[PDB]
């Protein structure tokens, strides 16, 4: 896997790969790695995909129980110790995760957490998880500023996937986007790696390394 | 987690016409030390069913407890005991097989290989085998141990598929396991002369075989060969 | 079945009070009077055995007052042995706070503690409640000296001078009387055998039927010390206030 | 996890705290405060396993917090590291033990005098002038124990923690992003924002 | 005394009968189902002026396609209720859809004879379950602590059940809109409620395949307060 | 050391049409370099319109295909006969599969049928419980031989509009049920001479509205 | 384990344990909460048949369960202890999981599904005891004051009392107390709560405390002069 | 009297008044009846309703494919009982893949019911059923009472009135048993059985109630416009 989020001026960018991997079988080009809690409230999904995925669709329905008990949203904090504190408990029991907790609430504005299966939970404005999280820290890093437009903070969040979907062999597939704003989170496509590169290439005159 | 002790060999069998037929000799090996000659590895239940079970023999007496007590749990609150509510092949094969894979799910299994053969209340042939591990497979020739790579090649020759049985008599399958039995005796180290047969109609029942020998041995080219080169 | 045979312990009369906890003041207003007086620099504890007999031994006794630490004692008042209980999970409850914090377990801590579980059956388990009332003695560096008070129904208050027992309604206008904030413990202890000695069922108050223990900064330097006073000690002190 | 240093001076105590958080071959953040609030007069700064570190100093504070709203009152320094070294000593002898090592750094108002303790995950506890847990110590106690002096000011404090500061970061192997200092003394506990 | 779970000579569970005496008690509740949605209304009943009305929750949510109102021990009904919505959430984990109204109403009278010598006594709270599902459509259920739950096109419960139920028994008819349903629990709620009925002692609901459960503003009931006494005066 | 686990061999393979759906399976049982059985069938029908084969450890592959059987028949019992749809018999199965995660089933699961707008839909498993719904999946023994094959001919990967300069990719379409059948019954005698777990028999289950239909054809027996 | 169901229906629908409980709040000294336009007063009345009274150390009898929230009751003191800790608890566990502190809805909530609990549980009888929970919840500054009961009822009140004659007091605020307008300081609030426990309770004395809660964790309790200074104060307004 | 205030208390005469109790509440019931042929074997359950309003209380719960039962009295301890057998009938196939004999399936249902008899604290079951079925020895009735005691028929009725319709049925012995292959005439012979029972109401459309199972014929249910048919 090659996960993203990052903060900044409008809000929080998502990006994701889309592949799964069983040693160097490719065993998927089309799985979601994003799961969609709420309007407000996205997770991300690196590490063992069942892992992930089973806890984080319950880590939703434990979100549903607190607005109905509360008659209140819950909150990013809230919602990233749940699914942490869970965690926690099957600390040494071999459970594999790297999460991204990531939403907009009042209280909190746009805000992001890092949960990992060794209990690791912390608040950060950018982070990269997965095999491939290096890659997209190289990209990441060195063109990320602030203030950067909705517009350049897609593309950034879009390329540095595709600099690890590269370079990293068990990362790949497509990528899919989503931004988060004031108002909720808005999906921005699913978009192959197999026409985005060569279009990425030609467009920005990137990747020379490449027979073009 | 266990480790076999006092051991069964090989348990054969095959579809026929209008029955089943199963065999197992009559040993209970100690390792390389053939201990005990006097033990019975095919056990009937009722006139309709004979379970031959290979492996450790400890764990096989465990098993003829549990299907002994079986007939008599069917027996009570039960006027058709005898009749239409008796005891079916496949209902004491569920039985076994899900105490097996219980077992083997608690990591304490009953170290067998067992061969549920029988027929049905409506005349149907039923054979079907299971493990230490729980798994469970039919066929229309059955066999455990060197069984499986002796006994079948010869079973399936007879009987190679479904369309094979009503073709087949008792008297050319019965021949096939006597054969098959040699075989094991030639090639075997952990086989004996002495062993068992059981034969189950549809027509004329539950026919148990006790104390048959492998016999028209091919020996006598032995004493041709000399040496082991020059 | 059983139900038959349960006396239902812990429930309400229709009037809102606790049946088996009025009950067990009914007992402890029958045990003999026990008084506590807390003065400027110490704490007097002194307590009336019940109806005494001449062949008794005197000195190697002990009915109402015990020891909890070094810088706690009690009162009792009704069912000794049904405070012995409670005397032990006390004593334990005290270790177990020094072996947490390694400090000694403040007075109002070991009150509550005590105090919550008499509380217990009289809300839980079917049991009869303890028939105790307890005049909790003691000093901590935040507070200094206290007095309280805890009964069957758990519930327990502070107090300057208090009694439990027998007779507490005519003792406690005597120590409202003659008590006085300025007070020093010398004065308390006067104070505390006349009370006795005045609201007494006997004929004369003397040393063989009392228990007098006093809690004081009495030691050599910003330390305290307890004193359970012995049978000569007890004749001497009853002699110098002039009551015999 | 990796660097805490915690000084006692004449009037209080001081803590330095590493901000990295490293995960495999990836710094994932260089602001982490590795410390959190026992009560007003006391803090604790923490490291170790990583979930452990967390899980056990907000286990702590919440076990603190709870103290102070029943009785009504603080806990002295010595009362809570007490109380710290227990759960850690019970903790050794678990299933899965806490593998946290702490240092708690407080003022005694009773007694108007700072206080250091350092306890490791074995519930070994110690009052010491200047304190380190992991790789730090074999540094900064032999600097400490030159440059040290009892009656020190706050200022003179923070001076010695720059001198300790700047020798990890020479000589140690992983950058560690510096470190957030906090100061605990009779009007409470304050961040040095600069450092 | 005698048994909690004890059967009389009349052949019924004492304890159950004696429970339906305090629903009784309780304040109105009123539910009436129609093709484009089901209506539950309640009679808040605030026991003194200075307690502060908004703060009585008797309708509450279950999911968002299934509501619930109350009448009797109300403080009974809160376990009830959590058990419920975890009911609900949980089958959506295991099945990845919406739980059925009459699972869910199954489910909740599944804890309603739980009791004996489990919990020590029956509950004291009565029940009406609004809801929507793909299969049987707009649904109304009434739960009580006999364990038992019938479907109901309309039900009141509470002290003034007999009568309202009698004027829904004229009322009621399978062509009725949402806003005449509206309507129709104000109008008999007035009817049979002790104080004056207004939008501080009386709250309404609705539940609707498209916008799902929804309790309605004081603002949005006040209207539909005026909008029923000028129809009344038309004739 | 006693070990729980064995392997039984075998390949299943899954592709969804339209308006159907087939799952198809070899009928071949095995351990180590013996035939335990020629015609062991593993592809079941599991009542409403759901098809089902757990391939890999055949007794952990029986036991979750009977509990899901019986979670089928219990289903009907607690939501008045309601029908079981293929997205909640999914994530059902993964609740089976994920409750023994710390020992777990050891088996490839895969699930076939139509969705609620009665389009052709097929589910694949790992064996903890991870899940996702595609066009395309083949499992099992085989699964690496016969899944790029897949990619190439119902999804249409690589192949690009001739003379279009390699710009315009072939347009992604629906296959009839009998070019489905075509590329299965290939995919298996391609996977039958290459690996030697797989061989026998092969049986296809078809699922439309109307029900579910059976197709058996003979593969190679060495 | 002691299983005997002690609350149980009667046939006219009457659970008596319950009913017997809310005798014993009535028995109990009287507690009074009146909120402002900014803040929360809680009043408490303590009988004078008790000199000789250590009051450093005597429990008092309003409770703190946060920093921001606080709890009086009437009733059984011993039960109160058992909800007060209970609450104390469940407020630290709170900051623990949601990162936040309690709401005064939420553990108001709490309490009082406790004792709702005591009510249908086998072998304990209800608590004799009701409350008065007030408090600011986080980064708030509307005023909240709710109530609790022994059958489990929670509600919230712009101005309440409870125990021993809190029907006279009641009556009195239900005249005093303009919804329209609060009182607006913080002396009107505490004015007028000293004023309704005049009506019940004797002596303005060591007789009535005060407590007053203010915006982000702002509690403080009154002295005796402070408090006398409003018994003197309404005294002579009241000779008119 | 003295000795009905639990199920472990005999009285002097040797009565057990809570089981009897507990009897008294199936009377109470809504009528239901059952009877059978060689082939198949029928349920046929009046339905009551709370008020015009309200929907008919559903009388008869499916335990297998070739299993189930028709309630009269508290219904919850029908749900109750018919958990239990669809539970015993579940594992009689998983363990043995076995279908569940009728006559097992009573046998385990009286030693249930008996356990709540003889203990304090516990109450005995408040319903009766009826239990029909097809299995390996053809067509079978069964009566449930929560005494313990089951009984094999060939037909019965069990409610309030259902001795009306088993004295129909005494009567109709010896046609309605040869009622073979036939469906339809069967249910009609139960219908017109279940019609002996009626005071003032009649069988509607969303009253009556009907079950079927036999040799060709899964255990099915018919209510609504289906069973207008039979009216
Ligand atoms: C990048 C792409 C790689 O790291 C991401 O991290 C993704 C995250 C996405 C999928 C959410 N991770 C994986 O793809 C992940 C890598 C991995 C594998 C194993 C352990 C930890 C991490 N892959 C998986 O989880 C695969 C997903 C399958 C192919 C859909 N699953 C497996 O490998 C499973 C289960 C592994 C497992 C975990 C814990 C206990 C037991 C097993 N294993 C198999 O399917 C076994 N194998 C398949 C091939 O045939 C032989 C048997
Ligand atoms: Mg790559």
């Given at each position: 896997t090659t996960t993203l989020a990052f903060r900044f001026q409008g809000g929080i960018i998502v990006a994701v790969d889309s592949r799964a991997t069983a040693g160097n079988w490719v065993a998927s080009q089309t799985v979601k790695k994003v799961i969609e809690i709420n309007p407000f409230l996205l997770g991300t999904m690196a590490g063992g995909t069942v892992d992930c995925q089973f806890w984080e669709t319950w880590l939703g329905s434990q979100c549903r129980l607190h607005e109905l008990r509360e008659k209140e949203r819950i909150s990013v904090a809230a919602a990233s110790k749940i699914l942490s504190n869970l965690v926690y408990q099957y600390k040494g029991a071999g459970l594999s995760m790297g999460t991204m907790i990531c939403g907009y609430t009042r209280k909190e504005g746009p805000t992001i957490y890092y949960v990992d299966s060794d209990g690791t939970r912390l608040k950060g404005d950018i982070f990269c998880v997965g095999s491939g999280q290096t890659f997209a820290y190289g990209v990441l890093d060195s063109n990320y500023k602030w203030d950067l437009s909705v517009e350049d903070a897609l593309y950034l969040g879009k390329r540095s996937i595709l600099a690890a979907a590269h370079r990293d062999a068990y990362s790949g597939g497509s990528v899919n986007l989503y931004h988060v704003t004031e108002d909720g989170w808005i999906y921005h496509g699913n978009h192959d790696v197999g026409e985005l590169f060569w279009k990425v290439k030609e467009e920005e005159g990137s990747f020379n390394n490449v027979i073009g | 987690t266990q480790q076999p002790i006092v051991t069964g060999t090989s348990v054969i069998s095959m579809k026929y016409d209008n029955g089943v037929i199963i065999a197992a000799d009559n040993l209970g090996s100690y390792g390389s030390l053939l201990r005990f000659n006097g033990v019975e590895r095919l056990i009937p239940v009722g006139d309709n069913t004979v379970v031959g079970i290979s492996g450790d023999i400890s764990d096989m007496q465990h098993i003829e407890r549990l299907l002994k007590d079986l007939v008599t749990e069917n027996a009570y609150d039960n006027p058709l005991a005898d009749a239409e509510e008796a005891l079916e092949p496949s209902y004491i094969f569920e039985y076994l097989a899900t105490v097996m894979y219980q077992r083997r799910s608690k990591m304490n299994p009953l170290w067998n290989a067992i061969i549920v053969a029988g027929v049905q209340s409506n005349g149907d042939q039923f054979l079907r085998y299971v493990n230490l591990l729980g798994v469970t497979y039919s066929s229309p020739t059955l066999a455990t141990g060197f069984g499986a790579h002796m006994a079948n090649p010869l079973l399936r020759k007879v009987v190679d598929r479904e369309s094979d049985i009503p073709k087949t008599t008792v008297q050319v399958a019965e021949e096939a396991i006597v054969n098959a039995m040699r075989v094991l005796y030639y090639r075997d180290a952990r086989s004996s002369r002495n062993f068992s047969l059981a034969i189950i109609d549809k027509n004329t029942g539950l026919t148990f075989k006790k104390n048959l020998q492998v016999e028209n041995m091919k020996w006598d080219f032995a004493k041709d060969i000399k040496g082991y080169g020059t | 079945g059983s139900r038959r045979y349960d006396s239902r312990t812990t429930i309400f009369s229709p009037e809102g009070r606790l049946y088996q906890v009025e009950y067990a003041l009914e007992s402890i207003s029958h045990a003999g009077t026990a008084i506590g007086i807390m003065a400027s620099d110490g704490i007097v504890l002194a307590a009336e055995r019940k109806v005494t007999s001449t062949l008794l031994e005197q000195d190697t006794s002990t009915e109402k007052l015990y020891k909890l630490n070094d810088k706690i004692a009690v009162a009792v008042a009704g069912l000794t042995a049904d405070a012995e209980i409670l005397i032990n999970t006390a004593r334990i409850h005290a270790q177990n706070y020094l072996k947490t914090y390694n400090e000694d377990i403040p007075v109002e801590i070991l009150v509550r503690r005590l105090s919550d579980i008499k509380q217990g059956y009289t809300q839980h388990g079917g049991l009869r409640p303890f028939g105790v009332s307890f005049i909790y003695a003691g000093y901590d560096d935040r507070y200094g000296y206290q007095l309280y008070t805890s009964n069957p129904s758990g519930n327990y208050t502070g107090w300057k001078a208090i009694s439990v027992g027998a007779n507490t309604s005519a003792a406690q206008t005597l120590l409202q009387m003659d008590y006085?904030?300025?007070?020093k413990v010398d004065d308390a202890i006067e104070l505390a055998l006349k009370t006795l000695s005045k609201t007494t069922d006997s004929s004369a108050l003397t040393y063989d039927r009392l228990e007098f223990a006093t809690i004081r900064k009495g030691a050599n330097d910003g330390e305290v010390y307890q004193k359970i006073f012995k049978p000569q000690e007890i004749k001497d002190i009853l002699v110098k206030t002039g009551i015999t | 996890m990796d660097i805490i240093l915690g000084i006692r001076v004449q009037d209080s105590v001081i803590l330095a705290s590493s901000k990295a958080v490293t995960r495999g071959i990836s710094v994932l953040k260089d602001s982490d405060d590795k410390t959190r609030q026992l009560s007003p007069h006391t803090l604790m700064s923490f490291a170790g396993e990583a979930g452990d570190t967390v899980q056990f100093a907000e286990y702590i504070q919440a076990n603190i917090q709870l103290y102070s709203i029943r009785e009504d009152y603080e806990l002295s320094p010595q009362a809570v590291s007490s109380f710290v070294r227990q759960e850690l000593a019970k903790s050794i002898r678990s299933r899965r033990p806490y593998q946290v090592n702490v240092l708690i750094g407080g003022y005694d108002k009773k007694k108007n005098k700072p206080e250091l303790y350092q306890i490791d995950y074995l519930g070994t506890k110690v009052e010491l002038p200047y304190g380190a847990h992991g790789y730090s110590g074999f540094y900064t106690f032999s600097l400490l124990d030159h440059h040290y002096r009892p009656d020190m000011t706050t200022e003179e404090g923070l001076d010695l923690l720059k001198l300790c500061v700047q020798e990890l970061e020479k000589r140690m192997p992983m950058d560690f992003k510096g470190v957030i200092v906090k100061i605990v003394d009779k009007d409470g506990i304050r961040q040095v924002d600069d450092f | 005394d005698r048994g909690v779970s004890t059967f009389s000579p009349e052949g019924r569970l004492f304890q159950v009968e004696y429970s339906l005496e305090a629903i009784k008690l309780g304040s109105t509740a009123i539910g009436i189902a129609t093709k484009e949605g089901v209506v539950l209304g309640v009679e808040k009943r605030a026991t003194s002026p200075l307690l502060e009305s908004d703060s009585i929750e008797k309708i509450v949510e279950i999911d968002r396609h299934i509501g619930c109102a109350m009448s009797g021990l109300t403080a009974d009904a809160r376990s009830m209720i959590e058990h419920a919505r975890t009911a609900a959430v949980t089958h959506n984990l295991y099945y990845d859809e919406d739980i059925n109204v009459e699972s869910l109403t199954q489910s909740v009278c599944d804890?309603?004879?739980?009791?004996?010598?489990?919990?020590?006594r029956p509950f004291g709270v009565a029940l009406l379950i609004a809801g929507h599902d793909a299969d049987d459509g707009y649904q109304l259920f009434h739960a009580e602590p006999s364990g038992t739950f019938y479907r109901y096109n309309a039900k009141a419960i509470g002290s003034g059940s007999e009568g309202a139920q009698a004027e829904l028994l004229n009322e009621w008819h399978s062509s009725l809109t949402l806003k005449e349903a509206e309507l129709l629990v104000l109008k008999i709620l007035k009817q049979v409620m002790e104080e004056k009925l207004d939008e501080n002692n009386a709250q309404l609901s609705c539940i609707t395949k498209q916008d799902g459960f929804k309790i309605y503003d004081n603002e949005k009931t006040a209207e539909l307060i005026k909008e029923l006494k000028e129809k009344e005066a038309a004739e | 050391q006693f070990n729980p686990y064995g392997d039984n061999g075998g390949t299943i393979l899954g592709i969804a049409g339209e308006d159907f759906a087939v799952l198809a399976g070899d009928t071949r049982n095995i351990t180590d370099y013996s035939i335990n059985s020629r015609y062991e069938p593993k592809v079941f029908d599991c009542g409403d319109n759901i098809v089902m084969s757990a391939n890999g450890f055949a007794a952990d592959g029986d036991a979750l295909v009977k509990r899901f059987k019986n979670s089928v028949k219990w289903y009907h019992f607690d939501h008045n006969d309601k029908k079981l749809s293929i997205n909640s018999a999914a994530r059902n199965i993964q609740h089976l599969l994920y409750g023994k995660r710390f020992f777990p089933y050891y088996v490839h699961t895969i699930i076939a049928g139509l969705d609620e707008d009665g389009k052709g839909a097929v589910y694949s498993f790992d064996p903890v419980g991870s899940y996702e719904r595609e066009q395309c999946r083949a499992g099992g023994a085989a699964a690496s031989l016969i899944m790029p094959f897949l990619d190439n001919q119902v999804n249409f990967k690589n192949q690009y509009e001739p003379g279009t300069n390699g710009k315009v990719k072939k347009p992604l379409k629906y296959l009839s049920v009998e070019e489905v059948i075509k590329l299965v019954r290939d995919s298996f005698t391609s996977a039958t001479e290459r690996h030697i777990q797989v061989g026998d028999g092969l049986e296809i289950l078809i699922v439309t509205k109307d029900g579910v239909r059976k197709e058996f054809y003979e593969l190679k027996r060495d | 384990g002691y299983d005997r169901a002690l609350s149980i229906f009667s046939?006219?629908?009457?659970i008596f344990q319950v009913e017997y409980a809310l005798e014993a709040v009535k028995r109990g000294t009287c507690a009074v909460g009146v909120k402002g336009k900014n803040c929360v007063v809680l009043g408490c009345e303590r009988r004078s048949t008790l000199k000789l009274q250590d009051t450093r150390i005597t429990p008092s009898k309003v409770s703190k369960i946060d920093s921001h929230v606080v709890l009086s009751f009437s009733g059984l003191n011993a039960d109160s202890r058992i909800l007060i800790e209970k609450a104390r608890v469940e407020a630290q566990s709170h900051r623990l999981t949601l990162e936040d502190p309690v709401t005064v809805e939420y553990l108001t909530r709490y309490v009082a599904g406790v004792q709702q609990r005591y009510t249908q549980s086998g072998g304990v009888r209800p608590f004799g005891v009701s409350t008065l929970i007030a408090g600011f919840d986080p980064r708030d500054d509307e005023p909240k004051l709710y109530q609790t009961e022994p059958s489990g009822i929670y509600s919230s009140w712009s101005a309440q009392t409870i125990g021993r004659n809190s029907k006279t007091v009641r009556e009195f605020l239900e005249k005093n107390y303009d919804r329209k307008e609060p009182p607006a300081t913080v002396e009107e609030c505490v004015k007028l709560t000293v004023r309704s426990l005049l009506e019940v309770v004797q002596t303005g004395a060591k007789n009535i405390e005060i407590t007053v809660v203010k915006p982000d964790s702002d509690i403080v309790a009154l002295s005796s002069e402070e408090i006398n200074q409003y018994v003197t104060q309404i005294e002579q307004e009241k000779q008119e | 009297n003295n000795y009905d205030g639990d199920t472990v208390t005999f009285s002097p005469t040797g009565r057990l008044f809570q089981v009897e109790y507990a009897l008294e509440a199936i009377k109470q019931g809504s009528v239901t009846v059952g009877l059978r042929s060689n082939t198949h074997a029928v349920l046929v359950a009046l339905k009551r309703n709370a008020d015009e309003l309200s929907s008919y209380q559903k009388k008869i719960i499916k335990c297998d494919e070739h299993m189930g039962l028709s309630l009269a009295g508290l219904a919850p301890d029908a749900r109750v009982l018919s958990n239990y057998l669809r539970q015993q009938c579940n594992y009689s196939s998983l363990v043995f893949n076995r279908k569940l004999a009728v006559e097992r399936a009573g046998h385990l249902l009286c030693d249930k019911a008996q356990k709540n008899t003889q203990s304090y604290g516990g109450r005995p079951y408040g319903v009766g059923l009826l239990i029909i079925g097809y299995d390996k020895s053809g067509a079978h009735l069964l009566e449930f009472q929560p005494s313990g005691n089951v009984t094999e028929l060939y037909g019965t009725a069990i409610g309030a009135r259902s001795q009306g319709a088993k004295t129909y049925l005494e009567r109709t012995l010896d046609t309605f048993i040869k009622i073979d292959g036939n469906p339809d005439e069967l249910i009609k012979a139960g219908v017109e059985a279940i019609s002996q029972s009626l005071r003032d109401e009649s069988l509607t459309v969303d009253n009556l109630s009907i079950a079927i199972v036999g040799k060709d014929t899964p255990f099915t249910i018919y209510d609504g416009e289906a069973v207008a048919k039979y009216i």
């Open positions: - | - | 006085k904030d300025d007070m | - | 804890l309603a004879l739980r009791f004996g010598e489990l919990m020590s | - | 046939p006219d629908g009457h | -």
